[PDB]
Amino acid sequence: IVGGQECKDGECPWQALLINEENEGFCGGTILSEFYILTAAHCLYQAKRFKVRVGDRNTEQEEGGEAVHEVEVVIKHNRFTKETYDFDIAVLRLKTPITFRMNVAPACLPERDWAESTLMTQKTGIVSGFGRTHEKGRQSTRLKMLEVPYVDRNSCKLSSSFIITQNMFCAGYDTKQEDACQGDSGGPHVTRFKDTYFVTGIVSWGEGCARKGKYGIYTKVTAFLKWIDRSMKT
């Protein structure tokens, strides 16, 4: 996350971190339930084997509230293509259930029509992660969050060098130096409504980070609600 603020105690409880063999974070995820994690499909082709850590806020010192979970089933959307980055979504079924506690809680999955009419029409959403704090910077040690404005669809289709599909949406700032970045991918994009946070996007991609005239691209969760529901039953 470039810019933004540090997630304080209990502020981003749905954040999950995908860790490789070196126990190093490389992508984010969103806690959907005690057994399921939502992430980006491209994050899978980015590591041999991996586990999921929940409850962490500082990858350095050990708080004691952190918990690691092995993945039992990986459900990657069959239409995802590195060629277009379309259908960038995946669901992970954990081998053991997550124990909700301070800094560990699921984000709510909204209903499609309501989400499109009430959530995505909101002024802003919130993105979070342990990603780089600078385009060329390094992986963040502390979990950060950033309020990102929803961007007009035509406005960002023009701003993108690549095709923005109906399964994607843009959020962020045109010139302001705040945006998600590498390392945040697969993480949560949530929208607050009456003090309740609903998952609305999956950090997907962008041309560089916080670059002028460019926005952050996210997978539109509403476009996959049925797919997610089906993945969570099998």
């Binding site: 409880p13 809680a105 984000a107 999955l109 009456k194 309740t196």
Partner: protein, 50 residues
């Protein structure tokens, strides 16, 4: 549902030209048919205090 989300805490539907509120998993609709009450500890979408 176009007027302040039908006064619903969460989901709002306009069935038979009438507001019908509903909630996400882990919540039960209150007696007033509008508020959503957590069915237990750590309801979805809520920042944690303890």
């Amino acid at each position: 549902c176009s007027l302040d989300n039908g006064d619903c805490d969460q989901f709002c539907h306009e069935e038979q030209n009438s507001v019908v509120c509903s909630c996400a998993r882990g919540y039960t609709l209150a007696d007033n048919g509008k508020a959503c009450i957590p069915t237990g500890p750590y309801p979805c979408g809520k920042q944690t205090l303890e």
